[PDB]
A paper describes a structure:
The conjugative transfer of plasmids between Gram-negative bacteria is mediated by type IV secretion system (T4SS) and many pathogens such as Helicobacter pylori, Bartonella and Brucella species use this strategy for the transfer of virulence factors into mammalian cells. T4SS typically comprise 12 membrane-associated proteins that fall into three categories: cytoplasmic ATPases (VirB4, VirB11 and VirD4), surface-exposed pilus components (VirB2 and VirB5) and core components associated with the inner and/or the outer membrane (VirB1, VirB3, VirB6, VirB7, VirB8, VirB9 and VirB10). Here, we conducted a fragment-based screen to identify novel chemical entities that bind to and may identify novel druggable sites on TraE and other VirB8-like proteins.
Using a differential scanning fluorimetry (DSF) assay in an RT-PCR instrument we screened a fragment library of 505 molecules identifying 16 molecules that significantly increase the thermal melting point of the purified periplasmic domain of TraE. Whereas docking predictions are increasingly reliable, the design of inhibitors requires high-resolution structural information and towards this goal we soaked TraE crystals with the binding fragments. Surprisingly, molecule 1E6 (2-furoic acid) bound to two sites on TraE. The first binding site is in the inhibitor-binding surface groove, whereas the second molecule binds to an α-helical region at the dimerization site of VirB8-like proteins as was predicted by docking. To our surprise, molecule 1E6 also binds to an alternative site that is close to the dimer interface of VirB8-like proteins. The discovery of this novel binding site opens additional opportunities for the design of small molecules that inhibit the functions of VirB8-like proteins. Since both fragments bind in close proximity we reasoned that combining them may generate small molecules with higher affinity. In silico docking predicted that all these molecules bind to one or both of the 1E6 binding sites observed by X-ray crystallography. Addition of the fragments as well as of the derived small molecules that do not stabilize the protein in the DSF assay at concentrations of 50 μM has no effect on conjugation.
Residue numbers in the entry:
A (entry chain D): 94 to 230
B (entry chain A): 88 to 230
The structure:
Amino acid sequence: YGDEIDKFWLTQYVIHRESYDFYSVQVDYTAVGLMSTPNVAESYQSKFKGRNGLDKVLGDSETTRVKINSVILDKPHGVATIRFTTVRRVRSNPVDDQPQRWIAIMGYEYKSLAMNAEQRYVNPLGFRVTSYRVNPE
Amino acid sequence: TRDQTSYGDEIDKFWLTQYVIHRESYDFYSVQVDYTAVGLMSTPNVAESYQSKFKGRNGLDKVLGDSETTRVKINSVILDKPHGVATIRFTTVRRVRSNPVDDQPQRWIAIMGYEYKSLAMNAEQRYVNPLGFRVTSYRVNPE
C-alpha cells in the first residue's frame, strides 16, 4: 500500500500493543486483535487471562507510554523493524521510571475482509501482523 | 471506497499531515510522487490551484530543479472531525544547494477542509490514496 501507509499501521500497532492505559486498553485490545492473525493475537491476549489479567491486576495504578524512534521496511517480504522506547509511570510515585529501549521485529500483510462498522474506524485497509517479536538493545 | 467525513483522530491526522508534507515540501527526487499524491488527495478546485505553479516553462520543478530543497516539520494538529476541518502548524527548512547552511526555519498554519469519497480508482491510485482521502479547502498563512 506504500511505505508511509505501511509505517503508520505498524507504528500504531506497536503503540496500541506496547502501551498501557486502563481507560483505553479496551480499544487497544480490540485494535491489536483486528490487526493480528488469531494465533499472534491470542499470544498477546495471554496477558489478559483469568483475574491475574494485566488490566485487572495493574488497574489504573500505573501507565506506560511508547515513543517511536525509527521504522525500517522490507516491502516484498512484508517484514519491518521498529525501534521504540517505553516509559513506565506509577501514579503514586513522583517521577517517571527510567526509559527502556526496545526493538520490534514484525511481519505484516493486507487482507480487507468482513467490512464492519466498528472495524472501519480501526483497520480499514485490513492490516494484520503475521509475526510479532520484541527484544531489548 | 466509502463516503465519510472522518476516520477518527489518528487516521485523519495521518492523511492530513501526509498531505501537508507532500504539498509543502520540495524535493526534486520526489516531486513527481508528491505532485501525483496531492492531485489524488484533492478536489479538482484544490488541485488546479496547486498544479498551477507547475505549469509552463517556469513550472516550479523546471525552474528550481535540484538547486534546492525544503523539508517539513509538523508541530501540531487540531482536528474538528464533525466538520472535516483541521488546523496544522508546521515548520519549513529551506536549503539552497549553493549554501553551506540551511535557511532559517519558517512557521506556518494550514487551515484545511477534508473528507473521504468513494470513487473509481485504478491500481496505482488506490496504492497512494486507498481510502479516497481528499482536501476540500486549503489555505496557508505565516505564524
